[PDB]
């Protein structure tokens, strides 16, 4: 869901 | 270090549109979640959306799906936020963030107004007639902001306050700037208000008397 | 939507001193993956956000040990274990688990001190501006604490609504008041129809409410  | 540089500071009409650019720096710009986030004038942070800049997937907050498109410039690892059909309420702050809201831009302002660059009318709060007296400026019907106020060119910054200035429904600012003073002092200092308003070349300098 | 209801709307800390802040999701949001997408924020004024805590509980690199987040189903806290000057300003959450990502509304963090009532300015408008058609009419609150103040106008005993807007300065760097200014703005024509100028002060450090008024 998140990036990074 | 990474680093989101944003676009400057925009005014524009109502129903014209912008496009501000969130630049990058210091990480793989396809590889990361770009956000964009409004912030109006005194008021809380809003999430507008986001977009993967490596195959252009989007998601929108639904207040926001026909007034902001988000693209990128792979090419020059740059974000962008597109604005159409501007009013009033679109004036705010607009900040980039990545992924997890992990870094941010320093923000990029936009005024969105029918009105001219108009210079102030400046008007003096003249003190009345515990040893202390109040007396003041009034910087009235600006556009755009900000005017600027000092006191005595610089010699008397002790006890002034320069307020925040406000909208009016006119679409002109207006704020006032006031000081403290020696009841003393009134009959033999002279106070002077020095206002500049650089986007219209206007600089006044006020005495204000009993 | 996901509400994210945070509390209290302001903190009056000091510094040296611990400080707890509050944050609710209206939405359990741990994710599918075991994460739990919720974050704090840090808005110095003038500034940025600045993220602080993510996860809950991780600490952003640079933080300081003094910062800590907790979370216990959809209750989330953040605590400073003693306060500087640097933690001063406007402290969000914000979940992204759930689409629309969410924000709280903000809680402020300002600077406790004594009690300060308001020394209290009335303004008419000048000669130079009723020349030029309008009428404003200034009241000033100079320096008190708490930021909570009430002004209300009257002219010849009518109570105005809708016609001044106030403006307040930020938390003053060296004695921590506030100060604020309530414009009311009339018509040259209207101004002149009217004797008795009134704004009354309502505030913590008054006794009793404080009126400062002229006579056209
Ligand atoms: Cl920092
Ligand atoms: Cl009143």
């Not at chain 2, 676009?7 to 109502?14: D, Y």
């Not at chain 2, 989007?58 to 009013?87: E, H, P, Q």
């Not at chain 3, 009419?137 to 009518?158: S, T």
Request: hydrophobic share 30%; glycine share 8%; net charge positive.
């Amino acid at each position: 869901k998140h990036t990074d | 270090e990474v680093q989101l540089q944003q676009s400057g500071p925009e005014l524009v009409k109502p129903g014209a549109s912008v496009k501000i650019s969130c630049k990058t720096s210091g990480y793989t710009f396809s590889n990361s979640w770009m956000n964009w986030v409004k912030q109006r004038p005194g008021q809380g942070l809003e999430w507008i959306g986001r977009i993967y800049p490596g195959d252009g997937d989007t998601n929108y907050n639904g207040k926001f799906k026909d007034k902001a498109t988000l693209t990128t410039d792979k090419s020059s690892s740059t974000a962008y936020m597109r604005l159409s059909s501007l009013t009033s309420v679109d004036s705010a702050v607009y900040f980039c963030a990545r992924s997890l809201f992990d870094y941010w831009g320093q923000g990029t302002t936009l005024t969105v107004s029918s009105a001219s660059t108009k210079g102030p009318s400046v008007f003096p709060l003249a003190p009345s007639s515990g040893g202390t007296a109040a007396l003041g400026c009034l910087v009235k019907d600006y556009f755009p902001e900000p005017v600027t106020v000092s006191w005595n060119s610089g010699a008397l910054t002790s006890g002034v306050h320069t307020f925040p200035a406000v909208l009016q429904s006119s679409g002109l600012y207006s704020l006032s700037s006031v000081v403290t003073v020696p009841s003393s002092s009134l009959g033999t200092q002279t106070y002077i208000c020095n206002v500049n308003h650089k986007p219209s070349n206007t600089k006044v300098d006020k005495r204000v008397e009993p | 939507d996901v509400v994210m209801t945070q509390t209290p709307l302001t903190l009056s800390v000091t510094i040296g001193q611990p400080a707890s802040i509050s944050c609710k999701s209206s939405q359990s949001l741990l994710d599918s993956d075991g994460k739990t997408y919720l974050i704090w924020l840090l808005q110095r004024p003038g500034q940025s956000p600045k993220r602080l805590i993510y996860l809950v509980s991780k600490l952003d690199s640079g933080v300081p040990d003094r910062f800590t987040g907790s979370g216990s189903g959809t209750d989330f806290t953040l605590k400073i274990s003693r306060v500087e000057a640097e933690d001063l300003g406007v402290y969000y959450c914000c979940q992204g688990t759930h689409f629309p990502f969410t924000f709280g509304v903000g809680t402020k963090l300002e600077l406790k001190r004594t009690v300060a009532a308001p020394s209290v300015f009335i303004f008419p408008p000048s000669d130079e501006q009723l020349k030029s058609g309008t009428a404003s009419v200034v009241c000033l609150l100079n320096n008190f604490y708490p930021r909570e103040a009430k002004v209300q106008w009257k002219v010849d005993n009518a109570l105005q609504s809708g016609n001044s807007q106030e403006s307040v300065t930020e938390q003053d760097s060296k004695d921590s008041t506030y100060s604020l200014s309530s414009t009311l703005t009339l018509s040259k024509a209207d101004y002149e129809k009217h004797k008795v100028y009134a704004c009354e002060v309502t505030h913590q450090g008054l006794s009793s409410p404080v009126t400062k008024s002229f006579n056209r």
